[PDB]
Amino acid sequence: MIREERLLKVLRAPHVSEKASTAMEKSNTIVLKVAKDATKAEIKAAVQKLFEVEVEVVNTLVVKGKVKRHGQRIGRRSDWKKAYVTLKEGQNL
Amino acid sequence: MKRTFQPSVLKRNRSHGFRARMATKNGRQVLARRRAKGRARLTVSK
Amino acid sequence: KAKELREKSVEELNTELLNLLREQFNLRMQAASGQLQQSHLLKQVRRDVARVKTLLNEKAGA
Amino acid sequence: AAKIRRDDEVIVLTGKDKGKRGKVKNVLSSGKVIVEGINLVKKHQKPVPALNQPGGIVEKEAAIQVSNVAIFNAATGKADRVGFRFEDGKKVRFFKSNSETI
Amino acid sequence: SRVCQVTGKRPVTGNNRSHALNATKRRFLPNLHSHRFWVESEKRFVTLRVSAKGMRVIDKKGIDTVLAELRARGEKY
RNA sequence: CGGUGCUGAAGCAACAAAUGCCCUGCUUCCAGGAAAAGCCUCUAAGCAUCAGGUAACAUCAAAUCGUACCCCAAACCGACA
RNA sequence: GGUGUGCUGUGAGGCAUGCUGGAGGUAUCAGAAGUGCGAAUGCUGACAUAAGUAACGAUAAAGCGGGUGAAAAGCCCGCUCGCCGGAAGACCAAGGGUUCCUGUCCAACGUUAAUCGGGGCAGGGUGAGUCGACCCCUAAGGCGAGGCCGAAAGGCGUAGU
RNA sequence: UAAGGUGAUAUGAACCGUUAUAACCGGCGAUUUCCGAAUGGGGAAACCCAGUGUGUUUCGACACACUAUCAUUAACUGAAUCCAUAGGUUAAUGAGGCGAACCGGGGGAACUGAAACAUCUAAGUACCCCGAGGAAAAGAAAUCAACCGAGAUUCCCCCAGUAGCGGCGAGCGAACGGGGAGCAGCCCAGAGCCUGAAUCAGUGUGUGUGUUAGUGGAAGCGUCUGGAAAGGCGCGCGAUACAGGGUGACAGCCCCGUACACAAAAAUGCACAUGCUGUGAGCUCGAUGAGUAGGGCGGGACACGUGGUAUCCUGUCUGAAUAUGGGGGGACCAUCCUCCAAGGCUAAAUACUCCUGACUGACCGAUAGUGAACCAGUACCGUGAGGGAAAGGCGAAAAGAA
Ligand SMILES: [Mg+2]
Ligand SMILES: [Mg+2]
Ligand SMILES: [Mg+2]
Ligand SMILES: [Mg+2]
Ligand SMILES: [Mg+2]
Ligand SMILES: [Mg+2]
Ligand SMILES: [Mg+2]
Ligand SMILES: [Mg+2]
Ligand SMILES: [Mg+2]
Ligand SMILES: [Mg+2]
Ligand SMILES: [Mg+2]
Ligand SMILES: [Mg+2]
Ligand SMILES: [Mg+2]
Ligand SMILES: [Mg+2]
Ligand SMILES: [Mg+2]
Ligand SMILES: [Mg+2]
Ligand SMILES: [Mg+2]
Ligand SMILES: [Mg+2]
Ligand SMILES: [Mg+2]
Ligand SMILES: [Mg+2]
Ligand SMILES: [Mg+2]
Ligand SMILES: [Mg+2]
Ligand SMILES: [Mg+2]
Ligand SMILES: [Mg+2]
Ligand SMILES: [Mg+2]
Ligand SMILES: [Mg+2]
Ligand SMILES: [Mg+2]
Ligand SMILES: [Mg+2]
Ligand SMILES: [Mg+2]
Ligand SMILES: [Mg+2]
Ligand SMILES: [Mg+2]
Ligand SMILES: [Mg+2]
Ligand SMILES: [Mg+2]
Ligand SMILES: [Mg+2]
Ligand SMILES: [Mg+2]
Ligand SMILES: [Mg+2]
Ligand SMILES: [Mg+2]
Ligand SMILES: [Mg+2]
C-alpha cells in the first residue's frame, strides 16, 4: 500500500469557491488543494483513509500561480495542484 | 514585412540552451564568464 | 521535551510520530477552514515532529 | 549585562521630562525604554471599522533613549550608575555610589 | 599524434628564414614510421610508431629493454 | 427581468452535388519515386511436468504533463492598441 | 551654504551687515594639489524655442430614445442605418502567458472624455485509459564506448544512442 | 549568555520566557528536495524512462539500496590458433568539476616604432592550451675566476645605460666583481660487515601556546541659554582608560566601549615531549649515468640579428673517450688553472589576494567613490556572445496630521 506518513501530507486544504460548492451539491464531488507531486492514486487512498469515505474517481489539474506586483516589485505566486474527488452516491462529508 | 526574430522555443534551446552551452569547452567558458559577472540568468530558459 | 522522548523505544517513537502527523493534519484542515484561532499550534507540532525524527535517526545509529 | 531592566525605578536625566521619575514598562531592542508617565505624545489615532474603534487624540508613552535615564537609588534619592559583581555564583547589579546590591 | 613512442620526439616549431631573413613559422616533424619489431622473448611481432633515430636506439639497446621502459612510462604497445 | 422552470408537433421524398471519400485505387509517363518499429510468420540456442502459446470468462490497471484566453491579431514578429 | 546691501583694493578679490538657513567653520604662517571653464557638432541633468502650431494611424457611417453617473458623441439597453462575409466569421499549430470570468476603482496607461478597457486592485477559472505531449520507431542530422588522427584544445567515426 | 523573545520591508495576530530546555552566540552532530562534474539510460538544466537486489502485501502496490566512464592493481574467464595473446567479467583504489591573482610548460599575434618599409621593433607581450602548489620554479658546479681565489639556488642594491649587439638605424643591453636578505645539504646507479642504530612519515598520548562564544572594566554635580545641554559659567573627580561610536547642539566621569585583568565543555592550528607503525643509520671495499658528448645540415635560446662566434637547446643525418679519461676558461692551438655532463631530491630569503580580522589615510562624499551608498550586474537592450543604467537625506522622537 501507500504509507500513512505519505498520506498525511498529500492533502493540504479544501478548496472553497462557488464552483466547488455546486460541484459538491450536484455531483457529490469535493475539491481539494493537494500536494504538488501527489498522484491520483495517492489522493484516492488519502481521502478514503483520512475522511473515511469511498472514492469513485479523482481528477486533477495544476493551477499556475499569478504574477502579482507588490508595490513596485513584481512577484509570482506558487503553482498548486487541485483535485476533483468524486465520491460514491451514498456518502457525505 | 518578415522581420529577423521569428521565435521558436525549440530552436532557441538547441542553440543557446544550457545543455548546448555545456557541450563544448567554449560554451562552458561562456557560463563561467556569466557566473563571474553575477548574471541572474545564465542562459535562455523559462 | 526531548528528554522524556529519549526514554522511549524505537517502536514507541514511531507511534508518537504518527500521532503528531495526524495531529498536524487536523490542524491544517482547521486552519484552512478558518476555524483555527490558536495559529501558534502549527509551529509547535511541526517542531516536535522534527524532534522525534531526530531521535529515530540517532537511535538507528545507536 | 543590561544595566536598566524592566520594572526598574528610574529617573530621567535629559529631555523635557528631566528630573521626573517612573517605572520601566518595557525595554526595546533598539536601546530604548518606555517609562510610564514619561515622554507623553498626543497621537491622532484614526478610527478603524474593524472593532468599530473610534478615532481620537490618545496620549501614549514614547520610547526614550536608555542612556537618558538612570536607575534611582532611593536610599540617597539621587540617580546612580550600575556595576556588576558575583555574590555567590550569580552576577548581580549594585549601585556605584554606596556599593549596595540592587 | 606525431610522437615517437621510444624517444618521445614530437613536432617542434621554428622559422623559415629566407634570403632577406623574413621569418615565417614552421614545424619540424620527426621522421616517424610504423614498424613491426620481432620480440624473441615473446615469439611475437610488436608494431611501434617510432622515429628513424628510435630504430637506431632499439638496435643498440635491444627491443626488450626498450619495451621495458615503455611499460615503465605507461605507454601501451 | 439577465434569465430560470415546464411542455413539446412534424421530423419525409425527390433532385442537384463537391477541390471531400472510394483512391496508398485505375490508366499513363520518366525525372523511376524514405527508413525503422508496431503487426504476421519462421525456426536456432533453450525449454519440455513445467514454462509458454491460443480461446473463453472474471477482475484490475491505463500513470505523468498540457488543457483558460488571443491567432490577418490591440494578446504573435514589427520600440506603438 | 543661499539671497540682498554697504564699504574697500590696481586686479584676481576682500570686509561688514539685513533676510534665509539650522550645525558646523577656521585666523596666521607654512605644506600638498582631482586648484579656477563660455566655447571642444564636449558629457549628464533640467528647462526653453518653434507653438498651443502639425498631428490624433485607412473616407466601413452613423442617428435617436432610455439607463447609469459628479459629468455620456464614445459605456449599457433598445430601435433604425451602414460595413465584412474564401472574412473584418469559426477553429488549430506556432508564439505569447492570465490578456479569460466576476466584483470594484479611474491617478497613470488609452493619441480626446470615459461611468468603459487587453489599465489598477481583489477573487475566481483550465477536470481526459480514447485529444496532444510523454511513450515505441526511425529520416536528415547530432553525439559517440572502444578506435583512427591530431603540438594541446581537439577532428572524424564503429558499436551504439 | 540571558530578561526578554518569535530575521527584514512590517504593523498585526497567535504565543513563548523571566534563575534557567525563551531567544541569542559558539563547538560538534543530525537533516540536507531537484538541477549542476552529475555518475543507471536519455534530455530542450531544474525533466523523461528504467534495470537489479532486497525488505514489505490491504495483490491496488510500496520502501530502500545499487547500477557512469577512465586509469591502476588483482582475480576469473577467454578468439582467429596448439600454447598463448587480444578480448570479456568482477573487485579494490584513484581521477573528472569549480575558483581572483601569483607559478611552470606547449603554442603565439598585430597595431605601433623605425617619422615610408621588408631585417629589426612592439614581444615571447596580448591571447589560447596544459599542469601544479601555498607558493611555484631553480638548486648542491663537467660554475666562475685569473696564477690570487671564490664555493648550490632564489631576491634586492650597485656594477651600467657601461662592454657589446644593431638596415651599427630605430632600438636592444649584459657579465665579471662588490654590498645585502636568506643559508642546508643529500640520494641512486652495490655488494659486504654491522644490522635494524640516525631520519622522516603515519598514528596515538601528554604539556604549552593560539583560534573558534565570552567576563569584569574607573570617575559630576550646580547654574545660564535653549525645544533639547554633551555648550557657557562655577566647583569637583578618574586616568596603564582623553581610541572610537552613540545619546534631543560639541560628553574623560550618560551609554557602548577603551587601558588593563581574566575565560573553554567541545573542535582545531602550531609547537614540544612520548608511544605505536613504516622508514632505514655506521664502516670497509667497489662502482662513477652512450645513440650520450662531439660533428654535418636546418632552426631556436644566450644582451650577442652568423658575424672571426664561444656557450646552451634539437628536427634531421651521424657519432667518441670513458679518470692512463673527459668538459670549460668567447674563433682556434699550446701551456696552465679549474671542474666531472649524459640519474634524481631538497627548507629559507621571492611572487600573489577570490577570501577573514584588526587598523590607517594632506583618499571620494551621491554627475564623486566600485557599474552598483538604494532589492545592481537589477530594469532595460540584443537571436546570441554581450552591453548595461537611473535612483541617498521628514523629525530628537511618527508625535506621519483625530
Ligand atoms: Mg472521468
Ligand atoms: Mg489532466
Ligand atoms: Mg539556429
Ligand atoms: Mg480545455
Ligand atoms: Mg479552449
Ligand atoms: Mg481563433
Ligand atoms: Mg479573424
Ligand atoms: Mg496590425
Ligand atoms: Mg548666513
Ligand atoms: Mg558651465
Ligand atoms: Mg575659451
Ligand atoms: Mg525640444
Ligand atoms: Mg507657424
Ligand atoms: Mg495651420
Ligand atoms: Mg489640423
Ligand atoms: Mg482613429
Ligand atoms: Mg444617447
Ligand atoms: Mg494583468
Ligand atoms: Mg475581459
Ligand atoms: Mg485620458
Ligand atoms: Mg484588466
Ligand atoms: Mg573516446
Ligand atoms: Mg562523431
Ligand atoms: Mg548523463
Ligand atoms: Mg542520471
Ligand atoms: Mg587456443
Ligand atoms: Mg610589423
Ligand atoms: Mg621581427
Ligand atoms: Mg592545495
Ligand atoms: Mg620545487
Ligand atoms: Mg562587559
Ligand atoms: Mg565603564
Ligand atoms: Mg544620554
Ligand atoms: Mg681564452
Ligand atoms: Mg687552486
Ligand atoms: Mg555613482
Ligand atoms: Mg547633493
Ligand atoms: Mg554609474
Swiss-Prot record, chain A:
Source organism of this protein record: Escherichia coli (strain K12)
Alphabetical UniProt keywords: Ribonucleoprotein, Ribosomal protein, RNA-binding, rRNA-binding
GO biological process: cytoplasmic translation; ribosomal large subunit assembly
Identification of the protein by name: Large ribosomal subunit protein uL23
InterPro entries, sorted: Nucleotide-bd_a/b_plait_sf, Ribosomal_uL23-like, Ribosomal_uL23/eL15/eS24_sf, Ribosomal_uL23_CS
Subunit record text: Part of the 50S ribosomal subunit. Contacts protein L29 and trigger factor. Might also contact SecE and probably does contact SecG and SecY when the SecYEG translocation complex is docked with the ribosome.
Function: One of the early assembly proteins, it binds 23S rRNA; is essential for growth. One of the proteins that surround the polypeptide exit tunnel on the outside of the subunit. Acts as the docking site for trigger factor for Ffh binding to the ribosome (SRP54) and to nascent polypeptide chains.
The family this protein is said to belong to: Belongs to the universal ribosomal protein uL23 family.
UniProtKB/Swiss-Prot annotation, chain B:
GO molecular function, one term: structural constituent of ribosome
Stored Pfam families: Ribosomal_L34 (PF00468)
InterPro entries: Ribosomal_bL34, Ribosomal_bL34_CS
Record keywords: Ribonucleoprotein, Ribosomal protein
GO BP, sorted A to Z: cytoplasmic translation
Keyword Transport: no
Key word Ribosomal protein present: yes
GO cellular component entries: cytoplasm; cytosolic large ribosomal subunit
Superkingdom of source: Bacteria
Protein family: Belongs to the bacterial ribosomal protein bL34 family.
Quaternary context: Part of the 50S ribosomal subunit.
PANTHER family per record: LARGE RIBOSOMAL SUBUNIT PROTEIN BL34M (PTHR14503:SF4), MITOCHONDRIAL RIBOSOMAL PROTEIN 34 FAMILY MEMBER (PTHR14503)
Protein's name according to its UniProt entry: Large ribosomal subunit protein bL34
Organism: Escherichia coli (strain K12)
Gene from which the chain derives: rpmH
UniProtKB/Swiss-Prot annotation, chain C:
Coiled-coil portions: none
One GO-annotated biological process of the protein: cytoplasmic translation
GO function term, MF aspect, one: structural constituent of ribosome
Reported consequences of knocking out the gene: Cells missing both S17 and L29 grow very slowly and have a rather unstable temperature-sensitive phenotype.
Superkingdom to which the source organism belongs: Bacteria
InterPro entries from the UniProt entry: Ribosomal_protein_uL29, Ribosomal_uL29, Ribosomal_uL29_CS, Ribosomal_uL29_sf
Secretion signal, residue range per the UniProt entry: none
Pfam families named among the record's database cross-references: Ribosomal_L29
UniProt KW keywords: Ribonucleoprotein, Ribosomal protein, RNA-binding, rRNA-binding
GO CC term (a single one): cytoplasm
Family per similarity comment: Belongs to the universal ribosomal protein uL29 family.
Complex and partners: Part of the 50s ribosomal subunit. Contacts protein L23, trigger factor and protein nascent chains. Might also contact SecE and probably does contact SecG when the SecYEG translocation complex is docked with the ribosome.
HAMAP family referenced in this protein's UniProt entry, alphabetically: Ribosomal_uL29
Name of the protein described by the UniProt record: Large ribosomal subunit protein uL29
Lineage: Bacteria, Pseudomonadati, Pseudomonadota, Gammaproteobacteria, Enterobacterales
Curated annotation (Swiss-Prot), chain D:
Record's protein name: Large ribosomal subunit protein uL24
Record carries keyword rRNA-binding: yes
Family matches, as SUPFAM superfamilies: Translation proteins SH3-like domain (SSF50104)
Top-level taxonomic group: Bacteria
Organism this protein belongs to: Escherichia coli (strain K12)
One Gene Ontology CC term in the entry: cytoplasm
Pfam family, one: ribosomal_L24
PROSITE patterns, sorted: RIBOSOMAL_L24
Any GO BP annotation: ribosomal large subunit assembly
PANTHER family on file: MITOCHONDRIAL RIBOSOMAL PROTEIN L24 (PTHR12903)
Name of the gene this protein is made from: rplX
GO molecular function: large ribosomal subunit rRNA binding; structural constituent of ribosome
Key words of the record: Ribonucleoprotein, Ribosomal protein, RNA-binding, rRNA-binding
Subunit structure: Part of the 50S ribosomal subunit. Might contact the SecYEG translocation complex when it is docked with the ribosome.
CDD domains registered for this protein in UniProt: KOW_RPL26
